Design a protein around this ligand. Structure first.
Ligand SMILES: NC(=O)C[C@H](N)C(=O)O
Ligand SMILES: NC(=O)C[C@H](N)C(=O)O
Lengths: 351, 369
C-alpha cells in the first residue's frame, strides 16, 4: 500500500542516484493527514528525540532550581555545530550544576559543520566531551541525576533513574506502551529510541499545540507548559539548536516562531507547526507535525525533500521559503563552474 | 518473510543500531563473461548507469589509440594515472606535471578544475596550509593530460579538447560504445565533475568493459597474436595492476584491492558509488562457469560509497574470488566500523541480497528492479 516515493538526482537528465522518502504529516492528536512512503516505518529518532529528552530533564524534581534559561534549554534540544559559543554555553551550564567536563559521559567527534571542522583541523584541535553535539542534553541529564540525588557517574546507563524517566517520557509523548519503543545506543553513548515515524511527527505536533495553548492562556497541564517552554526556547534560540548555516537554524529563523524543526542523524527530520492559515487549509483545526526519513540516510536529500514538502503543504510564504533555496535545490556545479544536473521530486503526497 | 519468494527488488545492504534498522540501500550488480553474457546478478543488472570514473580505462584506450601518442613515451605509471581517480597526493601532482612536460604543455592548458582531495589525509594537509587546489590537482588530471596529448598528436588544437565536438571526444564516444558493443544511441552523455563528457549505459556493459580488459591481459600473457585494440587493453590492465597507487592512492579501496590481488584483477571506482572489476581467468572464474575472464559491475542506487565498498567486498567473497587471506586486507571495508564517541560498537552492516544465476521454482519471476 505505501507508495513508491523517491527524490531523484540527475546529471544532464540521466538518473544518478535515487532515494526513498518516508514522511508523516499528523494533527495534534497524531491522526495521519498526509504521507509519503511508509508513514509508520520503524525509525530511530536519534537527535530528533531531543525535545522529548529535554522534557524528561525539565520534569525532574529540583531541576528548576538550577536556573537554566531559554538558550540553555535550546542547547538541551540541540545537535549543535560545536561552535565556540556552543562550547561556552555547555561550560556555563556545567557551572550552574557545579559539575565539570569530566562528569560528561558523551565523547567528542568531528564537527557537524564542515567549516568548523576545517578550522579545527587547521589548529590540530582534538574535540573532547564538551564539544559533543549532544553536550547540552548530557548536561541536562547530569543535572537531573544530581537534582534527585542519584549518582552522576552512570546517568547515561539504561538502569539509571534518569534514563528510566527518559524512556517513560518518550513512550508517553508517542502514546505508545513501553514495549512498542525499541532502544539502541546513540553516538553520544545514551540510550536512543526507535518508534513508528508518524509518532515522531506526533511529538512535534504536541510541541506546537502546547505553544498554541500557552499563547491562548489556558488551564494548561504542567506538561503542556513545559512542552510550550521547549518550543519557545528552540524558536527563540535556533542558533543554539544547530549553528550558523545549518538547516534547522535557517529554517526556524525564516519562520520566526511559526514552527520548530530538528534534525535526526542518518537523515530523519521533524517539524512542529503552530496553527495557522496553512494548517487550517490542510484540514486541521490545530497544530501539525511533520516527520521525514530518507531510507538510505542522505542528509542533502533530506533537506531538499523537507523544503519541497513545506512548499507542497503551503507552509510559509514563497518569500519565507526562498531563504532555504540552497537546500531545496542543492547546487550541482562542477570544478569548472558548469551546472551538471539537478534534483527532482517525482513523489506525490497522498491525503 | 518467505525465502521462496525473494526478488531482485529485495537486494539490500542494511546498517543497524542494536539490531534496529538504521539505513537501507538498494544494490545492483552484474557479473559477465568476456563476451558480456550475464552470469550472475543483483537487483537490475542492466540499470542505465553513469559510469563516471569507472569509464576511465575506456577513455585511456581512446587516448592510447590516438595516432602519434605513442611517441610521447608515456610509461606504465603514466597510463595508470590516465586510468586514475587519484588522491591528489604529491606524487600524483608530480606525475601530472611530468606528463605535461612530455607533451610540452602547461597546467594552464588543463580544462579540469581543482577540488577537495579524495583522501581525507591529503585534504587535512591542504586545510592546514589554506591551500586552494588547482587544475593540476584534479583526480582526473592524468586523463586530461592524455586527452591533451591526443589532441596535440593529431593536430587538432588543444583549447577545447574537452568539448563534445572535438575529435578527441568523438573518439572517446565511439570507443565507449564499441567496448560496450552498443549503438551510439544506446549510450547517453552528460558532463562530469572534471568537465568532460561522461557516459551512461546499462550496468552490465560496464562489467563487459572490464571483462574485456582482463581478457586482453590473458591473451597477452599467453602470447597470442592480438589486434592493436586488444594489445592496448592488455597494456591498460597491466598498468593499473602494476601501479595501483597511481589509480587511487594510499588507503584507498582500489589501491588496496589491486595490491591484495597482485595482478589477478583490476578494479576501479566511479563517483556516486559505482564499481567495476575485471578478473583474469582462474580456478575461481572456472568454478563460476566461464572458460575465460570475468567482469563485475556494481551500483548502489542512492550513491553511498561506504556501502559500495562493503558490498563489492561481500560480492567477491560470494563469488569465491580471492583467498580469505587476500580479501582480509579489505576487512575494514567489508564490515565498516560502527564505534561511537565513547568507543562502544553500536551496530553493523548486513547483506540481505541474494545472488541469482546458479535453483528456484520456475514460477518465481526475477523482475530486474
Ligand atoms: N544529531 C544526532 O542525532 C546525534 C545523535 N543523538 C548521536 O549521538 O549520535
Ligand atoms: N571518481 C569519479 O567518477 C570522478 C569523475 N570522473 C569526476 O569528474 O570527478
Amino acid at each position: 500500500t505505501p507508495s513508491e516515493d523517491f527524490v531523484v538526482t540527475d546529471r544532464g537528465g540521466i538518473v544518478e542516484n535515487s532515494h526513498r522518502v518516508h514522511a508523516a504529516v499528523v494533527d495534534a492528536k497524531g491522526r495521519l493527514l498526509y504521507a509519503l512512503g511508509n508513514p509508520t516505518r520503524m525509525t530511530l529518532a536519534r537527535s530528533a528525540a531531543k525535545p522529548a529528552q529535554a522534557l524528561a530533564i525539565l520534569e525532574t524534581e529540583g531541576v528548576a532550581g538550577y536556573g537554566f534559561d531559554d538558550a540553555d534549554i535550546a542547547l538541551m534540544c540541540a545537535s549543535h555545530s560545536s561552535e565556540d559559543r556552543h562550547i561556552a554555553r555547555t561550560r556555563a551550564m556545567l557551572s550552574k550544576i557545579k559539575a565539570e567536563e569530566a562528569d560528561l559521559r558523551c565523547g567528542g567527534h568531528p564537527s557537524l559543520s564542515e567549516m568548523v571542522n576545517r578550522s579545527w583541523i587547521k589548529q590540530d584541535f582534538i574535540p573532547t566531551a564538551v564539544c559533543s553535539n549532544c553536550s547540552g542534553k548530557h548536561v541536562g541529564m547530569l543535572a537531573g541525576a544530581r537534582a534527585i540525588g542519584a549518582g552522576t557517574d552512570g546517568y547515561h546507563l539504561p538502569d539509571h533513574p534518569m534514563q528510566g524517566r527518559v524512556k517513560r517520557t518518550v513512550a508517553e509523548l508517542c502514546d505508545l506502551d513501553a514495549g512498542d519503543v525499541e532502544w539502541g545506543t546513540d553516538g553520544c553513548n545514551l540510550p536512543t529510541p526507535a518508534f513508528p515515524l508518524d509518532r515522531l511527527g506526533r511529538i512535534y505536533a504536541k510541541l506546537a499545540s502546547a505553544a498554541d495553548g500557552s499563547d491562548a492562556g489556558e488551564g494548561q497541564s504542567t506538561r503542556c507548559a513545559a512542552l510550550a517552554h521547549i518550543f519557545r526556547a528552540m524558536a527563540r534560540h535556533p542558533e543554539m539548536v544547530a549553528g550558523e548555516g545549518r538547516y534547522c537554524t535557517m529554517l526556524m529563523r525564516a519562520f520566526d516562531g511559526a514552527l520548530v524543526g530538528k534534525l535526526g542523524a542518518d537523515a530523519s527530520y521533524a517539524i512542529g507547526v503552530r496553527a495557522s492559515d496553512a494548517t487550517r487549509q490542510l484540514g486541521t483545526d490545530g497544530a501539525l507535525g511533520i516527520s521525514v526519513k530518507i531510507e538510505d540516510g542522505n542528509l542533502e536529500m533530506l533537506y531538499a525533500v523537507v523544503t519541497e514538502l513545506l512548499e507542497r503543504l503551503g507552509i510559509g510564504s514563497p518569500d519565507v521559503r526562498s531563504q532555504l533555496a540552497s537546500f531545496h535545490h542543492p547546487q550541482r556545479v562542477n570544478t569548472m563552474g558548469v551546472t551538471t544536473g539537478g534534483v527532482s521530486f517525482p513523489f506525490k503526497l497522498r491525503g
